[PDB]
């Protein structure tokens, strides 16, 4: 019947745990659609994926696709307003983003479930009638240039483009996808090109319905969603565009057996080994490429990483297939190098080929296939319920590769065992088809080439035929053995019956001097999983720079020691996180509950009886040193955030103090440290998931007893449970701290307007105001003024204190950036005074939905509780309490709030600014003097010379009082 629909797919295979309804289909114009009905979702979502990307960029206008992506948000014939789309989402608790890859342009958004249509309608016009306004084009081109600017000094982007440049230049794979002002404005202007028209042509030529896939999720029934989509998208024209293909691999003969030496920005040592392979996408039912990735990248006993690590040459390894594009792929084996490893690259590669030989000798193993297959089935069946926005985005993308009925299982369920495909791929992993790249500062001054788009310095040499021969003649190494059955594979998935004393929030079931235990049996997700979070309190983890370094090294050495054993647990869906904090240690164990007690016991036992391998100590210590120094290569805005942190926190060691004390840590010193650190402790945990109260108390007591038995751990005094405070800025004061980033040629800035201590009223005043200025800030500071790609605003919360913050990374100097933000602040005051009571009440409603949005999965809900515990506020019913209060606020309250704490002449303005200057900028003032709003005059700021003196001269805020929670 329905002429608008070409076909309605059959039942969409889903997990029996998934309560959501699905319906796949294809419109007459060829758009592949997947509809999802979730009557409980608080936010609805939609996404569209055009199977065309930067690889299709015209040779003379690199980045056009990406620019097209940006421009579609800037207005359509149906909705002309520059930010009609953004403003609509923001006002209805929604959000949106989009990305461009070589073959895809993915657009997505989410919004309050009762406004899907309004949002979808505006969204559909992007693919129907974009305006590509001339004024918007001249401006938006800066955001793109700004985006590329931040990547220029990023080692990942540099290496990503270098591989493209080192392949065949004729192949479209060598194209520069990001684009910048030069390629999108300057250059095209020197060639009489009207970018407006090119955008119109590109959109008209490639944005064809036959190359699109859409996924929508909402509370509406499947029929309602169907009529909705048919009504908004069936009008997209089908121009029958052939799907681009690239059967000829970018790496041909002349590109093989090549060695590349690259100079990195950060001080890192890496070895990259690549093999050109066919496109294995079509073989998703067997995944031969992953089979080899599973083995070659395996950690655990007998693996390649094991030998490479025991020889002290490598620390980490990554192997497997890497995506290329329709027609080609690569198989990689990358590894970080130690100092010794750098001098043994040839030997490392030999081991790689020896292990590969072992695989050819043993032949394809079906039990290995069955194992991964069983794990993937368990993973799919008990997959966590995803958030709409990311879910619609993913589906829209994969609808292009799999049948409607299999779009959910395609990436999980394995069906075919293909020893013939496995051998076929293995036959490509040979010395004569290899590419090797080494990244090291040791190449500095020895290179003779430069990548044009990023300026990467490197050298290219052919691999000497004898080195190739030696690799080709690799024999079996007895140290290399296939993995054995994975004993961590779960088998018990029974969901315990919801106990009688089951509470809505975590309950305190143990309150002793040694430990405080918060517990909650899962009452809504019903999956065989659990979250076990432990907070270990010890003053010796952050007493001084030296101990902080040891706290770090200790845990880093420990994780390096359990790795081999822990890897199996990882593959079996059981992982953990262990790291040092300013208060001691943090341990988290999550995944299937079945075998968690086994991994946990093992970690704590190893923790309290650890024995440091000297060789491992020197290697990891050297890396840590580089890690600290490498902070100099981080982005300007990251530096700004870092400085503000050091400035506002009572106690904080800088990275300079850390590396300085790093030469004082010796093996003897570290060995003494550990027992000291564990001697006296206090543990606060949160056990949440498929577990009983008795299992929880049991797990908590097992941890303590293990520590008590091996480390003689004793309880910590209550007064020893210190919490750091935040510096209390003086009324009407303004301080400025200035620094310089010596790597990036961009400026960074962060402005913090401290308000007051956290509390129900103070929190919502700050949050309502942020909700109201959020979209206007982005639209004003970026879209119109184009200060930079990174323009952020929102609340800052720390040590129980809070306030409004602004973060911007730009080419413009900080003193100018500040002037603009001050100008924006005044624009908002007028804006709030001019908005209707309904518009105001609308933002309240939008903030309410954002705050009440339910977690979809166990770990998400656990995170919320963990936050209440970590901050020691324990306000588990915060969302309902705070929203109720918010619904009470008036426009007058917000106006008074701003006038009292935010305005330039505010009686209680507490302002601190962090100015990060660009590389090529010696000095720069701290203050200074079109169609831009007028910036108010600013007072003379006090320049912070020394951080320590700054804090000493200021008072400290008190800590927030805990919310009441009773139980024995």
């Amino acid at each position: 019947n329905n002429p608008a629909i070409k076909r309605i797919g059959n039942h969409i295979t889903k997990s029996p745990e998934d309560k959501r309804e699905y319906r796949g289909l294809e419109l007459a114009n060829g758009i592949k659609v997947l509809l999802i009905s979730d009557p409980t979702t608080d936010k609805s979502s939609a996404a569209l994926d055009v199977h065309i990307g930067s690889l299709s960029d015209p040779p003379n206008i690199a980045g056009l696709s990406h620019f097209c992506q940006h421009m579609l948000f800037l207005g359509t014939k149906k909705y002309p307003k520059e930010n009609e789309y953004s403003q609509f989402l923001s006002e209805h608790a929604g959000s949106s983003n989009a990305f461009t890859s070589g073959e895809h342009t993915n657009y997505y958004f989410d919004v309050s479930h009762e406004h899907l249509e309004g949002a979808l309608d505006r969204f559909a016009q992007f693919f129907l009638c974009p305006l590509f306004d001339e004024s918007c084009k001249d401006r938006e081109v800066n955001a793109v240039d700004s985006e590329h600017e931040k990547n220029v000094m990023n080692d990942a982007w540099r290496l990503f483009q270098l591989e493209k440049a080192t392949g065949n230049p004729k192949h479209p794979f060598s194209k520069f996808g990001t684009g910048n002002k030069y390629t999108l404005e300057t250059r095209p202007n020197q060639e009489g090109i009207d970018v407006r028209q090119e955008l119109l042509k590109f959109h008209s030529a490639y944005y064809s319905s036959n190359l699109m896939a859409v996924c929508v999720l909402g509370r509406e029934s499947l029929d309602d969603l169907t009529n909705l989509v048919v009504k908004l998208f069936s009008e997209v024209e089908n121009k029958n565009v052939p799907l681009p293909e690239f059967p000829e691999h970018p790496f041909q003969e002349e590109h093989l057996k090549q060695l590349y030496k690259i100079v990195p920005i950060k001080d890192i040592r890496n070895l990259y080994v690549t093999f050109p392979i066919p496109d294995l996408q079509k073989y998703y039912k067997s995944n031969p490429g992953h089979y080899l990735g599973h083995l070659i990248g395996h950690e655990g006993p007998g693996s390649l990483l094991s030998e490479l690590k025991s020889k002290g040459w490598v620390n980490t390894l990554v192997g497997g297939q890497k995506e290329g594009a329709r027609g080609f792929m690569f198989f990689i084996i990358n590894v970080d190098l130690t100092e010794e490893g750098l001098l043994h690259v040839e030997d490392i590669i030999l081991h790689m080929f020896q292990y590969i030989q072992k695989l050819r000798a043993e032949g394809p193993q079906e039990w290995v296939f069955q194992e991964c297959k069983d794990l993937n089935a368990v993973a799919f069946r008990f997959k966590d319920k995803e958030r709409p926005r990311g879910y619609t985005s993913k589906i829209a993308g994969i609808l292009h590769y799999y049948p409607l009925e299999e779009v959910l299982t395609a990436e999980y369920l394995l069906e075919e065992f293909r020893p013939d495909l496995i051998e076929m791929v293995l036959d490509k992993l040979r010395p004569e088809n290899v590419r090797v790249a080494i990244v090291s500062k040791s190449f500095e001054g020895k290179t003779d080439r430069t990548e044009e788009w990023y300026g990467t310095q490197y050298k290219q040499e052919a691999i000497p035929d004898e080195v190739i021969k030696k690799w080709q003649n690799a024999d079996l190494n007895g140290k290399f053995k296939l993995p054995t059955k994975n004993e961590f594979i779960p088998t018990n998935f029974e969901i315990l019956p919801l106990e009688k004393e089951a509470t809505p929030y975590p309950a305190l079931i143990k309150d002793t001097a040694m430990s405080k235990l918060w517990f909650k049996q899962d009452d809504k997700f019903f999956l065989p999983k659990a979250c076990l979070n432990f907070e270990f309190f010890s003053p010796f983890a952050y007493v001084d720079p030296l101990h902080c370094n040891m706290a770090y090294l200790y845990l880093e050495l420990l994780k390096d020691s359990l790795n081999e054993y822990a890897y199996a647990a990882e593959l079996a869906g059981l992982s953990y996180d262990l790291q040092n904090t300013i208060y001691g240690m943090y341990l988290s164990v999550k995944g299937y509950n079945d075998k968690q007690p086994i991994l946990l016991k093992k970690i704590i036992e190893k923790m309290a009886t650890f024995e440091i391998d000297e060789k491992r100590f020197e290697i990891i210590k050297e890396a840590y040193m580089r890690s600290l120094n490498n902070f100099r290569a981080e982005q300007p805005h990251q530096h700004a955030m870092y400085y503000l942190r050091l400035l506002m926190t009572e106690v904080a060691w800088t990275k300079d103090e850390l590396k300085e004390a790093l030469d004082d840590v010796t093996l003897p010193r570290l060995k003494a440290f550990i027992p000291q650190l564990l001697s006296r402790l206090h543990i606060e945990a949160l056990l949440h998931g498929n577990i009983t109260k008795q299992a929880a108390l049991g797990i908590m007591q097992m941890v303590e007893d293990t520590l008590i038995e091996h480390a003689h751990t004793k309880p910590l005094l209550p007064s020893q449970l210190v919490r750091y405070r935040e510096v209390q800025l003086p009324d009407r004061g303004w301080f400025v701290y200035q620094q310089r980033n010596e790597v990036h040629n961009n400026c960074g800035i962060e402005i913090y307007y401290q308000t007051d201590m956290q509390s129900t009223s103070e929190n919502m005043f700050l949050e309502l105001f942020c909700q109201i200025i959020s979209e206007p800030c982005f639209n004003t500071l970026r879209t119109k003024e184009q200060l930079g790609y990174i323009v952020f605003s929102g609340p800052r919360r720390a040590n129980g204190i809070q306030g409004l913050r602004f973060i911007i990374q730009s080419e413009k100097p900080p003193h100018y950036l500040e002037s603009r933000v001050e100008a924006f602040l005044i624009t908002m005051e007028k804006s709030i005074e001019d908005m209707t009571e309904e518009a105001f009440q609308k933002h309240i409603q939008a903030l309410a939905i954002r705050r009440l949005d339910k977690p979809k999965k166990l770990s998400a809900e656990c995170a919320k509780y963990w936050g209440e515990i970590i901050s020691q506020q324990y306000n588990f019913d915060r969302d309902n309490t705070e929203v109720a209060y918010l619904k009470t606020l008036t426009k007058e309250d917000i106006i008074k709030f701003y006038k009292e704490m935010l305005a330039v002449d505010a009686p209680r303005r507490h302002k601190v600014s962090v100015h990060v200057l660009a590389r090529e900028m010696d000095s720069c003032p701290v203050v200074g003097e079109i169609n831009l709003s007028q910036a108010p005059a600013l007072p003379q700021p006090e320049v912070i010379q020394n951080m320590t003196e700054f804090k000493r001269g200021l008072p400290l805020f008190p800590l927030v009082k805990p919310h009441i929670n009773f139980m024995a």
Partner: peptide, 18 residues
Amino acid sequence: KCNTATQRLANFLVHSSN
């Protein structure tokens, strides 16, 4: 580890709020 478990690099409209 398996690459399958890894940061493909694409260009996003907006930076991450996280």
